[PDB]
C-alpha cells in the first residue's frame, strides 16, 4: 500500500533533540515525490546517494527521525559536523546514506509570549555514537560523586531553547526529519512506484 510518510511530517508535535523519536517504516510502496515537488523544505541535503536514485533502489527498511533544532543548528546535523547538537544530542555517522529534511515552523510551533517547551543537552561525559538517544536527567559534574541540583560545580544537563517569534531568521524553530536508508541484501520490502 501507500507508504506512511505523511504521518512523519504532518504530526501534532515533535520531540526535542535530546529525546528524538524514530520510526520503523517497512514493507511499503514509497513514492519520493512529495519531497521534490514542494519547496517549503529549507535544507534538502541528501548524503550517500542522490535524489534521483531514491525512486529506483529497493531499500530494505527505512528509518525516520524528528526533532526541533535552534534554527542555526541544521548545519551541525550533517555527516561530519561538530558543535553542541551533534556530539551529545544527535550524532550522525560519516557514511550516512540518507536525506536531511528541515523546514521552518515559526508560526506552528512558536508563541509570542514564550515557547519554553523544547530543551537540549549540553553537558555529558564524552560524545555520543551514531543514532544514539540518551534520555536522562541525572545531574552533571566534571568528576564522579553524583551531586544535588543545589551545588557549587554541579549543573543541570539540559537547557531550554527559548523560541520566540520577534527574532531574526536564525533563532527560529525548525523541524528536521532525518531519513536513514538501510540497504541490506534482504528481500525487498520498500521499492519505488510503478
Amino acid at each position, epitope marked *: 500500500n501507500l507508504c506512511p510518510f505523511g504521518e512523519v511530517f504532518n504530526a501534532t508535535k515533535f520531540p526535542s533533540v535530546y529525546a528524538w523519536e524514530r520510526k520503523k517504516i517497512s514493507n511499503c510502496v514509497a513514492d519520493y515525490s512529495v519531497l521534490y515537488n514542494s519547496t517549503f523544505f529549507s535544507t534538502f541535503k541528501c548524503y550517500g546517494v542522490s535524489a534521483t536514485k531514491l525512486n529506483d533502489l529497493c531499500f530494505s527498511n527505512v528509518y525516520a527521525d524528528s526533532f526541533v533544532v535552534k534554527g542555526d543548528d541544521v548545519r551541525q546535523i550533517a555527516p561530519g559536523q561538530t558543535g553542541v547538537i551533534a556530539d551529545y544530542n544527535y550524532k550522525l555517522p560519516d557514511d550516512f546514506m540518507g536525506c536531511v529534511l528541515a523546514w521552518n515552523t515559526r508560526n506552528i510551533d512558536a508563541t509570542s509570549t514564550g515557547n519554553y517547551n523544547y530543551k537540549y543537552r549540553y553537558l555529558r561525559h564524552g560524545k555520543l555514537r551514531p543514532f544514539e538517544r540518551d534520555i536522562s536527567n541525572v545531574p552533571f559534574s566534571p568528576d564522579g560523586k553524583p551531586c544535588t541540583p543545589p551545588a557549587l560545580n554541579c549543573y543541570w544537563p539540559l537547557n531550554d531553547y527559548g523560541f520566540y517569534t520577534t527574532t531574526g531568521i536564525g533563532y527560529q524553530p525548525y523541524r528536521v526529519v532525518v531519513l*536513514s536508508f538501510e540497504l*541490506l*541484501n534482504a528481500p525487498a520490502t520498500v521499492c519505488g512506484p510503478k
Partner: antibody
Framework: QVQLVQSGAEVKKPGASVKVSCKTSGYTFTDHYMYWVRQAPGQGLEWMGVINPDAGSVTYAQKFQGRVTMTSDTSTSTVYMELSSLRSEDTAVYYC???????????????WGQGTLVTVSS | EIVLTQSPATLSLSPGERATLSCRASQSVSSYLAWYQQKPGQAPRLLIYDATNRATGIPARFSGSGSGTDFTLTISSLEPEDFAVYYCQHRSNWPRMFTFGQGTKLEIKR
C-alpha cells in the same frame, strides 16, 4: 555489562546442517547490528554475516550465498545461524559479534561471543 | 573486493620497544579501518576503530593512524599481555562487505 553467551561444541557429518545460537544479554536487543564471523585453525576470518534483528533483514557473503540462512527472535533475544552443505573445509570456530554503532549505521565489532568449535568427521 | 595485505606477518620485538604494524589495501579506500587483537585461545578484541579513534578500555599505549592507502598501528610501550595476533578490517559501503587481513603475530625477542 554486555556479554554474548553461545552454545557448546557441535560435531556434525559431511553433508548435514549446523544450527548454532547466540544469546544476547546486558543491552537493549532492539537497536544493534549483529554479525557472525568464523576463524579457521591457523587461517583468518572472512565473511560478514550481518543480521539486522529488527524484523527480518539479512545480508550474507559471496562465498556463502545459499549455504547460510540466519534468523532472529525478538522474544528470546537470540540469533540463529543455519549453515547447510557442510564440506570438509568448514571445520572451524564460529563467533558472533555485536556492532559499535546502532541499526542504521555500521562499524567495527565491539562485543564478541565465546566461539563454537564445529568439526566434520566420525 | 578490497584485499587487505599485511607485509611483515611476523614481528619479533622486545618487551618495551615500539611496534610498526602496517595494513595496506588494494584500492584507495577511505579511513574506514578497524584493528583488532586476538589473544591465542580467547576471542578478538576491538583495538582501534575508524583508524584514528581509540575504543573503550584500551590503554593509552595503543595509538593508530593512517589515511587512504597507508595505515599504521604503533604501540608506545609493549607489555607482556600485548603479544598476540593483530588483524585489520575494512568495511565496504554498498553491499555491506567486510574484509580481514592475515594477522601480524607479535612475539617476544629472546
Amino acid at each position: 555489562q554486555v556479554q554474548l553467551v553461545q552454545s557448546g561444541a557441535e560435531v556434525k557429518k559431511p553433508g548435514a546442517s549446523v544450527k548454532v545460537s547466540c544469546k544476547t544479554s546486558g543491552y537493549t536487543f532492539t537497536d544493534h547490528y549483529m554479525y557472525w564471523v568464523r576463524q579457521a585453525p591457523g587461517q583468518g576470518l572472512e565473511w560478514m554475516g550481518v543480521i539486522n534483528p529488527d524484523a527480518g533483514s539479512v545480508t550474507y557473503a559471496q562465498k556463502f550465498q545459499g549455504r547460510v540462512t540466519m534468523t532472529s527472535d525478538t522474544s528470546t533475544s537470540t540469533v540463529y545461524m543455519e549453515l547447510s552443505s557442510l564440506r570438509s573445509e568448514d571445520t572451524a570456530v564460529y563467533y558472533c559479534a555485536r556492532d559499535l554503532f546502532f541499526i542504521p549505521a555500521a562499524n567495527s565489532f565491539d562485543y564478541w561471543g565465546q566461539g563454537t568449535l564445529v568439526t566434520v568427521s566420525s | 573486493e578490497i584485499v587487505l595485505t599485511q607485509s611483515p606477518a611476523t614481528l619479533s620485538l622486545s618487551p618495551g620497544e615500539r611496534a610498526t604494524l602496517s595494513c595496506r589495501a588494494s584500492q584507495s579506500v577511505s579511513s574506514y579501518l578497524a584493528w583488532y587483537q586476538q589473544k591465542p585461545g580467547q576471542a578478538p578484541r576491538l583495538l582501534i576503530y575508524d583508524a584514528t579513534n581509540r575504543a573503550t578500555g584500551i590503554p593509552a599505549r595503543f595509538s593508530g593512524s593512517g589515511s587512504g592507502t597507508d595505515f599504521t598501528l604503533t604501540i608506545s610501550s609493549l607489555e607482556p599481555e600485548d603479544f598476540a595476533v593483530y588483524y585489520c578490517q575494512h568495511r565496504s559501503n554498498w553491499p555491506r562487505m567486510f574484509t580481514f587481513g592475515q594477522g601480524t603475530k607479535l612475539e617476544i625477542k629472546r
